[PDB]
Scaffold this active site. Structure first.
Site, short mmCIF file in Angstrom:
data_model
loop_
_atom_site.label_atom_id
_atom_site.label_comp_id
_atom_site.label_asym_id
_atom_site.label_seq_id
_atom_site.Cartn_x
_atom_site.Cartn_y
_atom_site.Cartn_z
N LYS A 162 0.77 -1.20 0.00
CA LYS A 162 0.03 -0.02 0.01
C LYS A 162 0.83 1.21 0.01
O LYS A 162 0.54 2.30 -0.77
CB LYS A 162 -0.82 0.06 1.26
CG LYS A 162 -1.71 -1.31 1.29
CD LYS A 162 -2.84 -1.33 2.36
CE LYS A 162 -2.67 -0.90 3.65
NZ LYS A 162 -1.86 -1.92 4.34
N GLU A 188 0.71 5.17 11.27
CA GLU A 188 2.10 4.64 10.36
C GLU A 188 3.56 4.96 10.85
O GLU A 188 3.54 5.70 11.79
CB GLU A 188 1.93 4.71 8.84
CG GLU A 188 1.29 3.70 8.19
CD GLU A 188 1.27 2.24 8.95
OE1 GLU A 188 2.51 1.44 8.74
OE2 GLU A 188 0.56 1.75 9.53
N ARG A 189 4.43 4.35 10.63
CA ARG A 189 5.82 4.29 10.93
C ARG A 189 6.34 5.79 10.91
O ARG A 189 5.97 6.37 9.80
CB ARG A 189 6.65 3.19 10.52
CG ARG A 189 5.99 1.86 10.06
CD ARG A 189 7.02 0.94 9.32
NE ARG A 189 6.22 -0.24 9.11
CZ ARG A 189 5.93 -0.30 7.84
NH1 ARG A 189 5.88 0.48 6.69
NH2 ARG A 189 5.24 -1.72 7.65
N1 ATP Z 1 6.10 -3.38 -6.57
C1 ATP Z 1 6.72 -3.95 -5.93
N2 ATP Z 1 7.88 -4.74 -5.95
C2 ATP Z 1 8.48 -5.43 -5.07
N3 ATP Z 1 8.17 -5.63 -3.79
C3 ATP Z 1 6.99 -5.03 -3.44
C4 ATP Z 1 6.07 -4.20 -4.32
N4 ATP Z 1 5.21 -3.62 -3.57
C5 ATP Z 1 5.22 -3.98 -2.47
N5 ATP Z 1 6.31 -4.69 -2.20
C6 ATP Z 1 6.78 -5.44 -0.89
O1 ATP Z 1 5.73 -4.97 -0.03
C7 ATP Z 1 6.35 -4.54 1.11
C8 ATP Z 1 5.65 -3.54 2.11
O2 ATP Z 1 4.96 -2.63 0.89
P1 ATP Z 1 4.62 -1.31 1.83
O3 ATP Z 1 5.29 -0.95 2.84
O4 ATP Z 1 4.45 -0.24 0.48
O5 ATP Z 1 3.04 -1.39 1.91
P2 ATP Z 1 2.28 -1.60 3.50
O6 ATP Z 1 3.53 -2.16 4.23
O7 ATP Z 1 1.14 -2.29 3.42
O8 ATP Z 1 2.01 -0.15 4.01
P3 ATP Z 1 1.65 -0.02 5.42
O9 ATP Z 1 1.86 -1.01 6.27
O10 ATP Z 1 2.55 1.45 6.00
O11 ATP Z 1 0.29 0.52 5.54
C9 ATP Z 1 7.71 -3.93 0.82
O12 ATP Z 1 8.89 -4.39 1.67
C10 ATP Z 1 8.02 -4.54 -0.56
O13 ATP Z 1 9.32 -5.63 -0.44
#
Ligand code: ATP
Ligand code: ATP
Ligand code: ADP
Lengths: 478, 501, 11, 179, 480, 72
Positions: A162, A188-189
């Site tokens: 995300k 968030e962080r």
């Molecule tokens: N397009 C991509 N290519 C490779 N890895 C990805 C990609 N999109 C996301 N990831 C993996 O997803 C992990 C976390 O994604 P991101 O931190 O953007 O979202 P999130 O953790 O759901 O956000 P939050 O927890 O802050 O709401 C990253 O470490 C990455 O390794």
């Protein structure tokens, strides 16, 4: 003089304040409490009135840490709601929940303030123009187009992509979009609130010398604050964009991350305010809590607010009450799967569970909506066949069925697209692809002029010629 | 531990306690919570009586507790101040109603919110009114032209039915309701669309598509945004029903659309929780069923003695992840005459509108259709259920019989003729001629994609060639033999015209 | 009906 | 302390403050406590299986036999008809509490082996007048052969604040021995 | 009687009422409020006291609406439970819970009346008569025979065919009955009750030109009513039927729909009467209440009551505590499914889950019992075969197995009959099948001599002769 | 029936007697067992008995447990 009273109770972040009898604070009035520190006088603890308990007593959630608060200290009522500074001072600055600079720079203008609990613009003041807002990602461009001025929701589990997605949207958009973009970090962080800041500063979006021309404001309700602060940073960012949209007439962008923490803040403080628990864990006033943010994020004839936001669905559950009530106040949803994340097709956007209100042939024309419709049709055909495939395989099918299975196996890979941000993870550098070429790539896929070359050719490319040159390239290294 | 003892009331009652007096005329404010106020005093007030606060915000005395009154707020109680006085309005929650509301967007307060002017209405009607009993009713016996060929052939909705439009997220429900309203532009029904708890942009989008399609002379848009309290959202469908109920008492056929009813249900759950009433399954009150029943049973057809002015409900309910076992979907299913279930999986698969004809119910049936469609759509929905169930099994097979495979082909043609495009209404003449070309096997000789592309040209052909068909189907409502001969000639000559192609 | 249909899919 | 009872005691203190009859009501509720110290009459009024008219009559006979103003009695009337009768002992302990609080007669306790005179009582009275803001400072004495050297003074809303000058030095020593 | 009780609290549908300490009403008495409506005229809002609370306040339950009731109203004890009129006057009149004629006719002869709350008969006055009666619906005739004088449940979901089946069952049984019938509507659609009233006005059993020659008495406590009316209409109707069987001593009928709305009304009002919540939200007084209602419905040595009652099942889960409680107090149970409902087979009676107590060798004859258990056998075989032939395929079964699959696929369609009241929903004239015809049809289908007929020939046909004539019709049309 | 005793308490009874009846059956079987004589007893069903006891508990404001059955 403003009427001052003493706190009778304290139960963590919930503060019970008694007053002199005739003079009581209103609803949402802020209570600047003096407090006691180890050194000096802290006073930074501050309460807003939620309830009136009778016996000339109110109950008030504290915005800052509740230690220091000894029972029986003087509490002054300001008389107004919580009011944050806004205008030219906040630009290029990282703000706190109460509208106070936290980036350790000079004091901002304490003059052009506005209260955070201002009501929503009236139904007459709405604009009714529907225009597509292309961002360069294949899955939003073909399937679920985002709307200029419409709130856009990003869903997904924990670490499913995300924040890299919202950072890539910021990367493509906020450079050319000549309006202020108020990022809001709710729950968030602080690492993200720092890495975003360092990218903004090193890029030149926030130039230190000449901080005036910055056209980006920030605010951060991170994961180290009491539930009041993570409950009010959303309204802080909202009025800090509302002033720009109302007065400067600017098209304003808004990026909130992630409002499920803003929901969980109220769900954590309502169990302390004594109110009866609603559905499984949340507060009873849940959808009203949602609306009191979302309805104020509408575009008018005066300006525009486009609000990308991440809506973290909890425990990978999509029908939990907080995402369920988030789903209604959005113009497009793009839900981020765990299966497509674990299988590596990144971004992990669920294609046919992503929906927008703008996929209509009057907006995007006949050809685009037609291609999008047939793409979703073939994807669902493969999705229906997936159980029969997973149990037994592919040989048992007809040829006309394996034609759709093969086409959708090519589509499910071509729905990936390498990111300008996530190049530092995978190693494949970022590609921006247009809508007018995404459609032609998907038309070349669905025609059958490309079905001969393999399925991993389409994986992690941009334009269609990158996929065809990928097929031509991987037949050279023998 | 118990309220109404706040040590100013105790001295107020201890200064005089050789007495049995009553303080009916006034009342104080002891608590102001998150939209609900506890009132001391008001020793005469009904359950439901309108009570006005010192700021000037009206409320309803829902819980008439022992010594103090738990009053809910029909507004935002930001300026309420405790100890200040309240009143009694004496009337029990009435809204003005007359024929000047037509085409204006109204709050749940029944005060217009598009700024087009103030509205005049002499006679008033309570927002809650009892449903018509058994003597003032009759059987549902008029049709209702929804415009969609699928519902109008297979799930016949009639004037006085209440067809629950149940579905999931973004599967076309409001689209169904809006086509139902927009189609009526020559039949003189008074449409009512009560939008409860929707996004304000969606309300403005629906009213703009309405005012562009010409339905501003029909409707009333009783729409409030999300920023209303729980009480205004919970009250809005009763206001919409009060308006449409006024109209159907004046022998006008009406049409009301509740959109949604789970939003009113969650609004009611808020007030049942903030008044500390006990919660039930999924923290809903026990009486949300009775709430939906008292709201939904007001829509029916009035008898020959009360002017026969019908009133049709079309309540809309979304289901998360496509279930029914949750509380509010199950309740609204059990109350309504049938249900229409729209499946998002048939929606993404091109079948639009996405009516799952297996589990969609019509409890009035072909007594809600004219004699023409009653003849040609006699055993249609049941034979389509049979074709769907045997096509699901003919995939478990390798070799079949030619008779059953031709049956599968004809069922596929019947399945293909019912995809109706959005904002594309079919009239009853178009509907019955399409379905007669369908069910008799006049389509079984062409390819799959050619079905609709043939049918629309045939319909325009009979439009510009045979007005006698239109007059037979319209004036007399019965599918005579002369019309059938006309139609058979039309199919044959159209088949020759495409054989030229 | 969810647990019964889930048990039956298990079976 | 916003209990179910200190609201009632604060109401009665409010009535006696607006009426100017506090120092009389102090001995009034002293009589009423020596009434409600006995278990049979407090048990007569407390238990809910005795009819209301006879309760009216017997409390009226208590009034006509002890001579009370309705300033006092209307409290018992409101209590009995509000079924707060079983909290009368809590209210009558909190009445003198709030009455001392508002009228400033603050109570100071000492617990030691003390065989004291007016001197130590008077100096501790004025000292706690200075540090606690006592309008009128009144003492309480407890003879205790346990704590040997000094005393143990408590005061505040309930007697919460403490400084003991007898055994605190003892516990500091036996704690800093091993430390 | 002759006290003056004051309202002390109104929490929606429940009231708290106080009396002078001399007189206090008994449990299940009948208060009556001398209140006022919006126009100022005295309007009565009848009430039943469900609970003594102490401190000379009791807790009531409103039999009508509370909108307009003020703290400070006066109530009068009636010193009795809610008496309902009985006799020959309760024939052909719509009736509320309050015993008032709801249809626009005159009043009722109230010299003979009976209270609602009485106790079930003694153990010695129960008539052990186990005679069978031919219903007509092929499944209801063969697979699940109905006991005369014994209770009968129509367990079904929402919109599967409970109400259609019970209306067609009235259409079949009432005109061929030998006694009176009573109808109690407990929480249904008002237009559907009026549909029944009009369809029975034109079906003569009202014969509304001359009253008291009718053979049906109609009670209705439907969905637009406060929980008191729904909670007590079942008791009103049962008291009428009990009068018809105890004083007249004639066979009465009692169609109770919907009983789940009775239990739901109990729970709705029960969460607010102070009681702790039981399992998923029903009242703690579930099972003994369904006993206090159901066990009065019984055959007896004076005149039996066959009680075809329609039980709703929430979310199509027979696990649910209200169907779990209701199963015990019923003899001849019928399960209506959703699979056979959307499958096209109407009625949607599940052949395997519907099971009765009358299907016995010594109760319903030898050939019927053998053919019924054999039909259930081959269907259980098919439903066991289904999750194998799904993924395996149809060319990988043996001849006995494929023959079983095809014969079961004929049988399932043959158990679908176009009802008399469903001609609006089917598009076919109504049908009535005998028991003889049904057992003939299943002997013929099972024994092998019809495996050349189409598997749509048995769809919506009355007799096996009609299945053969439809088969000729299909094949002739296909050959042209 | 020349030897069988059948105690019975149907659904229309209160929860009290449904809760009681298996104990009366058990006391009869205990007595006949203590007369040096072999016995048998059939309970039908314990689910109705448990529902009666659960109702008797929840009416007495005993704290509910798993699926509303009290901790006893
Ligand atoms: N397009 C991509 N290519 C490779 N890895 C990805 C990609 N999109 C996301 N990831 C993996 O997803 C992990 C976390 O994604 P991101 O931190 O953007 O979202 P999130 O953790 O759901 O956000 P939050 O927890 O802050 O709401 C990253 O470490 C990455 O390794
Ligand atoms: N028959 C049809 N053919 C093509 N498109 C259709 C058809 N019916 C509906 N749609 C499309 O579906 C889109 C969304 O429908 P709609 O908003 O009614 O669903 P909804 O359930 O109201 O959404 P929400 O879940 O937000 O309430 C419409 O914009 C319309 O374009
Ligand atoms: N025997 C039947 N033949 C044809 N249609 C039926 C039959 N039984 C039920 N239906 C369908 O079911 C609907 C009525 O079901 P109903 O019994 O009213 O629902 P419920 O069981 O929830 O009361 C009708 O619309 C009809 O289409």
């Amino acid at each position: 003089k403003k009427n001052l009273g003493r706190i009778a109770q304290i139960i963590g972040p919930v503060l019970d304040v008694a007053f002199p009898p005739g003079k009581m604070p209103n609803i949402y009035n802020a209570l600047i409490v003096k407090g006691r520190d180890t050194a000096g006088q802290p006073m930074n603890v501050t309460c807003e009135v939620q309830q009136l308990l009778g016996n000339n007593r109110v109950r008030a959630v504290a915005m800052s840490a509740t230690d220091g608060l000894t029972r029986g200290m003087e509490v002054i009522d300001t008389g107004a709601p919580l009011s944050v500074p806004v205008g030219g001072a906040t630009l290029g600055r990282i703000f706190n929940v109460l509208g106070e600079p936290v980036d350790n720079l000079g004091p901002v203008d304490t003059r052009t303030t506005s209260p955070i609990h201002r009501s929503a613009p009236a139904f007459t003041q709405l604009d009714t123009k529907l225009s597509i807002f292309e961002t360069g990602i294949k899955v939003v461009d073909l399937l679920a187009p985002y709307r200029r001025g419409g709130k856009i929701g990003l869903f997904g589990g924990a670490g499913v992509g995300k924040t890299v997605l919202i950072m890539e949207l910021i990367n493509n958009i906020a450079k050319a979009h000549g309006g202020v973009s108020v990022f809001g970090g709710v729950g968030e962080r602080t690492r993200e609130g720092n890495d975003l800041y360092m990218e903004m500063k090193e890029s030149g979006v926030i130039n230190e010398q000449n901080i005036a021309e910055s056209k980006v404001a920030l605010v951060y309700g991170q994961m180290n604050e009491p539930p009041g602060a993570r409950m009010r940073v959303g309204l802080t960012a909202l009025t800090m964009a509302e002033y720009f949209r109302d007065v400067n007439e600017q098209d304003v962008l808004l990026f909130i991350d992630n409002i499920f923490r803003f929901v969980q803040a109220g769900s954590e403080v309502s169990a302390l305010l004594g109110r009866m628990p609603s559905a499984v864990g949340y507060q009873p006033t849940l959808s009203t809590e949602m609306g009191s943010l979302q309805e104020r994020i509408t575009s008018t004839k005066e300006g525009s607010i486009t609000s990308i936001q991440a809506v973290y669905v909890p425990a990978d559950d999509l029908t939990d009450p907080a995402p369920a009530t988030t789903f209604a106040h959005l113009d497009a949803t793009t839900v981020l799967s765990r299966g497509l994340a674990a299988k590596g097709i990144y971004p992990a956007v669920d294609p046919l569970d992503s929906t927008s209100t703008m996929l209509q042939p009057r907006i995007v024309g006949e050809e685009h909506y037609e291609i999008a419709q047939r793409v979703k049709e073939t994807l669902q055909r493969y999705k229906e066949l997936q159980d029969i495939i997973a149990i037994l395989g592919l040989d048992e099918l007809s040829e006309e069925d394996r034609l759709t299975v093969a086409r959708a196996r090519k589509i499910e890979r071509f729905l990936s697209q390498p990111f300008f941000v996530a190049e530092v993870f995978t190693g494949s550098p970022g590609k921006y692809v247009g809508l007018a070429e995404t459609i032609r790539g998907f038309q070349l896929i669905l025609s059958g002029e490309l079905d001969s070359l393999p399925e991993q050719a389409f994986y992690l490319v941009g334009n269609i010629d990158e996929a065809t040159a990928k097929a031509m390239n991987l037949e050279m290294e023998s | 531990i118990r309220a109404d003892e706040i040590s100013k009331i105790i001295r107020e009652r201890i200064e005089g306690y050789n007495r049995e007096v009553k303080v009916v005329n006034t009342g104080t404010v002891l608590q102001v919570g998150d939209g609900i106020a506890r009132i001391h005093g008001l020793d005469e007030v009904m359950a439901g009586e309108l009570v006005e606060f010192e700021e000037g915000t009206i409320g309803i005395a829902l819980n008439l507790e022992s010594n103090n009154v738990g009053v809910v707020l029909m507004g935002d109680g930001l300026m309420i101040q405790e100890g200040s006085s309240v009143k009694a309005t004496g009337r029990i929650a009435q809204i003005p109603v007359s024929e000047a509301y037509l085409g204006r967007v109204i709050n749940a307060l029944a005060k217009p919110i598009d700024g087009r002017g103030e509205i005049t209405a002499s006679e008033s009607r309570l927002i809650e009114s009892p449903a018509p009993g058994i003597m003032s009713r009759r059987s549902v016996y008029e049709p209702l032209q929804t415009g969609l060929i699928a519902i109008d052939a297979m799930i016949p909705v009639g004037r006085g039915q209440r067809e629950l439009i149940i579905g999931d997220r973004q599967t076309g429900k409001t689209a169904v309701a809006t086509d139902t309203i927009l189609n009526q532009q020559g039949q003189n029904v008074i449409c009512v669309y009560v939008a409860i708890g929707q996004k304000a942009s969606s309300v403005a989008q629906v009213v703009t598509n309405f005012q562009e399609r010409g339905a501003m002379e029909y409707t009333i848009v009783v729409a409030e945004t999300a920023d209303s309290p729980a009480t205004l959202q919970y009250l809005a469908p009763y206001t919409g029903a009060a308006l449409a109920e006024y109209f159907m008492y004046r022998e006008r056929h009406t049409l009301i659309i509740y959109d949604d009813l789970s939003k009113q249900a969650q609004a009611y759950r808020q007030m049942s929780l903030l008044l500390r009433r006990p919660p039930g399954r999924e923290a809903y009150p026990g009486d949300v069923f009775y709430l939906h029943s008292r709201l939904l049973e007001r829509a029916a057809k009035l008898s020959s003695l009360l002017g026969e002015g019908s009133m049709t409900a079309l309540p809309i309910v979304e289901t998360q992840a496509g279930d029914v076992s949750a509380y509010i979907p199950t309740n609204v299913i059990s109350i309504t005459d049938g249900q229409i279930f729209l499946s998002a999986d048939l929606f993404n698969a091109g079948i639009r509108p996405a009516i799952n004809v297996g589990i969609s119910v019509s409890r009035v049936g072909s007594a809600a259709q004219i004699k023409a469609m009653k003849k040609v759509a006699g055993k249609l929905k049941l034979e389509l259920a049979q074709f769907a169930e045997l096509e699901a099994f003919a995939q478990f097979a390798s070799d079949l019989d030619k008779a059953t495979q031709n049956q599968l082909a004809r069922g596929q043609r019947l399945r293909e003729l019912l995809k109706q495009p959005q904002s594309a209404p079919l009239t009853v003449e178009e509907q019955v001629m399409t379905i007669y070309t369908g069910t008799n096997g006049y389509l079984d000789s062409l390819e799959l994609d050619q079905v609709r592309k043939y049918l629309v040209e045939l319909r325009t052909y009979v439009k510009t060639n045979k007005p006698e068909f239109q007059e037979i189907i319209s004036s007399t409502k019965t599918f005579t033999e002369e019309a059938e001969a006309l139609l058979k000639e039309a199919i044959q000559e159209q088949m020759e015209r495409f054989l030229l192609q | 009906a969810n647990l019964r249909e889930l048990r039956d899919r298990i079976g | 302390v916003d209990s179910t009872a200190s609201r009632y005691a604060s109401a009665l203190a409010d009535v006696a403050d607006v009426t100017g009859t506090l120092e009389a009501t102090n001995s009034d509720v002293e009589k009423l406590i020596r009434i409600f110290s006995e278990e049979p009459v407090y048990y007569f009024f407390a238990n809910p299986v005795i009819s209301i008219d006879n309760k009216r009559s017997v409390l009226d006979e208590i009034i006509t036999t002890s001579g009370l103003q309705p300033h006092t009695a209307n409290f018992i009337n409101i209590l009995i008809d509000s079924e707060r009768i079983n909290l009368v002992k809590e209210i009558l302990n909190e009445f003198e509490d709030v009455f001392n609080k508002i009228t400033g007669t603050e109570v100071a306790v000492v617990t030691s082996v003390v065989k004291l005179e007016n001197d130590h009582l008077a100096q501790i009275a004025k000292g706690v007048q200075k540090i606690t803001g006592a309008k009128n400072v009144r003492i309480k004495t407890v003879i205790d052969p346990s704590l040997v050297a000094g005393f143990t003074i408590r005061y505040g809303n309930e007697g919460s604040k403490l400084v003991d000058m007898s055994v605190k030095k003892q516990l500091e020593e036996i704690a800093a021995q091993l430390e």
